[PDB]
Every structure is written in C-alpha cells, then in structure tokens.
Design a protein around this ligand. Structure first.
Ligand code: SF4
Ligand SMILES: [Cl-]
Ligand code: NA
Length: 409
C-alpha cells in the first residue's frame, strides 16, 4: 500500500512471471553520496557502481542515473532562459525562477500564485527522465508503457508529491504514471539492511543507458555545477561565444540563506544577440535589466543571479524583490537549508557538518576538475535529433514541460 511496498511487490514477481513488469529505477546523486551512512559509514564510502549492483540485486531491470534527466533539464532550461532573454532584448516574463524543487512549487502555487508566469515550465530531472523512459525507451524496447514501472530514489520527502501531479501521465490516462514510486535514501538503506545486503561489500555493477543501447549511464565524465548553473552556462556560452567557468556564489549581507553572483555578458561578434543589443536599445517590480556599454559601443548585459535555500529565507527574498530592494534576473529556490544533500529523506547524523561532507564527496576529484556540457552528450544529441526535435519544441514541450495551478493541486 505504501509506495515502497508497491515497488517491492513488483520486484517480488519472478522475472518470468506472466504478470511481471519491466521495473526501472533512477538514482539521484544526493542519494549515492549519503547511502553509505545508512551502514554507519562516511558519505561517499560506497561507490556509485556498488549502489547500481545493490539495486540490480533487488531485481530492477534497469538502473539509471538521474543525471541523464538533469542533462534534459539543462537543455530545456538553458534554452528557456535564452529565449526569455532574447524576447526581452527585442522588446514569459523576467525574472525567471527555477522549478526543480517541489517544496518551492507548492509554496508558489499556494502562497504566491501571482508569480506563476515567472516560473520555468521545465519538469524536474526525475520527471524528464521518467517521461522519456515511458515514451522513447518503451517504444524502443517494444514494451507497452503500462508494463513499465518507474521508481526513483531521492533525498527528498516531497518528490512523490511532484510525481503525483495528475497530468504527469501517459496519453491522458492518469492511472498510467510517468513516475510511479519514490523511495528515499533512508527507505532504500532500510530495504538493503532488511535483506542483508551490505553495499560496501558488493562488487562493482553497471548502469543502464536510458537510450537502451550503449554502455554506461549515458552521461559523460565530469560535472556541471547543477541544473541552475548549467542552464546559465548554456545561455551564456551561446550568447557570448565564451566559456562560463564554475560559479562561486557569494553570501548576501543582511539576508539569510541567499547567495548571488553577477554575470557580465557581451554578445558574440556578428551574432543576433549583438544586433538586438545595438539596434533595439507585474508583481515583481522588474527594472528592465542591468546593462553596460563602452565608448566604442561594445555593450553587454549583466545577469543577476540568486539562490535561496530555505522557504522562510525565500519568502524574505521575494518580499525584497517585490519592494525593488533586491534585483535579480534568475533565481533558484530550494526548500532545504542545505539543498538536496540535506533533504528530508537523508540519514540523520550527529555531525553538524554532515551536509558539507556530503557535498565534498558528491563527485570525485577527477570528475570535479572536468566541466561537462549537456549539449555535447551524444546520447542527448541523439534523443533530440531522432525523437524530441528542438528544445522548447512541441514534442519537448509535451514530454518535458509542465504548468502550475494557482491555489495548488
Ligand atoms: S531542496 Fe529539499 S525539498 Fe527541494 S528538491 Fe531538494 S531535497 Fe527536495
Ligand atoms: Cl529531480
Ligand atoms: Na550498461
């Protein structure tokens, strides 16, 4: 009856049982780093492939990395940000708010419904991957979507409410969910312990590529800095023709839980963006944007970015934004004070710095030194080229975008 119980019941069916479904799991990075703590070990003390092996030992037919879903979110959100910028340069409002945290989306709908048009229409990484699995991958494997079960392992006690939004379903049948069951880090750790599975003693397993062909997880080596940063990078690099380094946000004096950075953007020589800047020179009192110019006319825009952690802190930021005392163009609100590594589904620790330890072990040092870019991922390129079309296009909109409901759902 619980979602854990339903998922385990699907796995309990022998693989050759005529009523067996194709049971898929996707795993968030915050889960991978914290799951070792369920054994009393340090964050990161078990490897990603040990976790993949453990999941395969529970009976999962596919084991996916949610980072594949995040590459889709980066493609869509980066394009969406650049589109809003483009529309505003040529005279879907700015500022844009990210949409990946369901705690934020719940507060948005209930308490700030007038802000709905400013929020990204992107689904979350877990929902984009789920939508893809029950469309593209089902078709590829010749499996009816109703015979697919999608489970996510999340650090978050709110991701089931996200998955349960009614229209996240296949062909307007609300009982055919894109994402069926969410299991938290601690629930999964309990499942392993109840079965005598010790992740730390497992051999390395393998990931499956959600494209259904090829080796590995379908995500390239390296790190992005997360969906918000990589969406910014996508827009910035197209706008300027120059690389965006890893960001370092600074604390905002006088506002708890708020960090910021300003990103100066000069359009690439000969680009449409350069043309737009030169030729064409609501609830949130947006100031028409920050810009700069030089004596010879090489002008640019300055993108003002904020991240709010904690919903109380976000409410204070929104108050200041409405007052015009805080001026931002792109804002990420996450409900958890420490972000997802400190989510409500994570192990409890006496270590006041456990979330710092989780963040540090979240990706290895070799991968942290390497910046990767979602649009360079051959699996992502193939999916757009042969199935989705263009970011923000009709098919991408259908599978990967969503809407919001004033008053909540
Ligand atoms: S910040 Fe917290 S509530 Fe929001 S997605 Fe992450 S774990 Fe869930
Ligand atoms: Cl997600
Ligand atoms: Na594989």
């Amino acid at each position: 009856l619980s979602h854990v119980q339903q998922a385990l019941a699907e796995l309990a069916k022998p693989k050759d049982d005529p009523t067996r479904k194709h049971v898929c799991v996707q795993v968030a990075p915050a889960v991978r780093v914290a799951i070792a703590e369920t054994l009393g070990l340090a964050p990161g003390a078990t490897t990603p492939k040990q976790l993949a092996e453990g999941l395969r030992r529970l009976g999962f037919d596919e084991v996916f990395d949610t980072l594949f879903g995040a590459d889709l979110t980066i493609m869509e959100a980066g394009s969406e940000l650049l589109h809003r910028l483009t529309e505003h340069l040529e005279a879907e409002p700015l500022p844009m708010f990210t949409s990946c945290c369901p705690g934020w989306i719940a507060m948005l709908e209930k308490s700030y419904p007038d802000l709905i048009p400013y929020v990204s229409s992107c689904k979350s990484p877990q929902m984009m991957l789920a939508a893809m699995v029950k469309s593209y991958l089902a078709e590829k494997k010749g499996i009816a979507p109703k015979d697919m079960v999608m489970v996510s392992i999340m650090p978050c006690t709110r991701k089931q409410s996200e998955a349960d939004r009614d229209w996240f379903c296949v062909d307007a049948d609300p009982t055919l969910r894109q994402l069926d069951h969410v299991i938290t880090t601690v629930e999964l750790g309990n499942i392993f312990k109840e079965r005598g599975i010790n992740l730390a003693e497992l051999p390395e397993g393998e990931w499956d590529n959600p494209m259904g062909v090829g080796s590995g997880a379908g995500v390239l080596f390296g790190t992005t800095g997360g969906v918000m940063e990589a969406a910014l990078r996508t827009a910035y690099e197209l706008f300027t023709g120059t690389p965006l380094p890893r960001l370092s946000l600074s604390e905002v004096r006088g506002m708890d839980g708020i960090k910021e950075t300003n990103i100066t953007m000069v359009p690439a020589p000969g680009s449409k963006f350069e043309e737009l800047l030169k030729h064409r020179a609501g609830p949130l009192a947006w100031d028409g944007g920050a810009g700069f110019t030089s004596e010879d006319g090489r002008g640019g825009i300055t993108l003002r970015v904020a991240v709010a952690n904690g919903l109380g802190n976000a409410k204070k930021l929104i108050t200041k934004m409405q007052a015009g005392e805080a001026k931002y163009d792109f804002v990420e609100i996450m409900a958890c004070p420490a972000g997802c590594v400190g989510g409500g589904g994570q192990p409890r620790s006496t270590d006041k710095a456990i979330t710092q330890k989780r963040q540090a072990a979240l990706y290895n040092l070799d991968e942290k030194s390497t910046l990767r870019r979602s649009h360079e991922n051959p699996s992502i390129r193939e999916l757009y080229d042969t199935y989705l079309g263009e970011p923000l296009g009709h098919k991408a909109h259908e599978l990967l975008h969503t809407h919001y409901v004033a008053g909540g759902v």
